[PDB]
């Protein structure tokens, strides 16, 4: 039983959507934005990812410790979106449902596409594990 290929982690740059359906990937990329202190980005995407799954009883609570933990000014973990989708978001979390971060979501995603993605695929990390499998 393989468990990881070379061929698997050179799929991960081709968008950073290959790397997060890759459980692996995810863990790997993860570690790198943890030593580059900006890990809040994908911590905070795979929570909404969870939300999204969540009970519908369970959206108020959810949707607080989401917005605590990453999005409120006062979070350890304080996600770069702009003033007016922060704005909007913190508007939405008083009744929330199943869509409520999407914007703050999307805006996160990006942010990782266009910057720290990028950098994951020239870091030794990454190109270590893939020259090495192989």
């Known amino acids: 039983k393989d468990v990881l ?14 790397l997060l359906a ?21 911590e905070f995407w795979l929570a909404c990812e969870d939300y999204k799954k969540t009970e519908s009883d369970l959206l108020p609570c959810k949707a607080e410790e989401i917005y605590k933990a990453f999005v409120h000014s006062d979070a350890a973990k304080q996600i770069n ?3 007016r989708t922060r704005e909007s978001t913190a508007k939405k979390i008083k009744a929330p449902t199943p869509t409520c971060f999407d914007e ?13 993605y990028p ?5 030794d990390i990454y190109l270590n594990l893939l020259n090495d499998l192989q």
């Not at 459980?23 to 980005?41: A, C, H, P």
């Open 5 to 18: 290929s070379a061929a698997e982690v050179m799929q991960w740059s081709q968008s950073l959507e290959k």
């Open 22 to 42: 890759n459980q692996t990937g995810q863990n790997v990329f993860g570690s790198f934005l943890k030593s580059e202190f900006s890990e809040e980005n994908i």
């Open 81 to 83: 979106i702009d003033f």
């Open 104 to 116: 703050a979501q999307k805006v996160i995603y990006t942010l990782m596409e266009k910057d720290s």
């Open 119 to 123: 950098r994951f695929l020239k870091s």
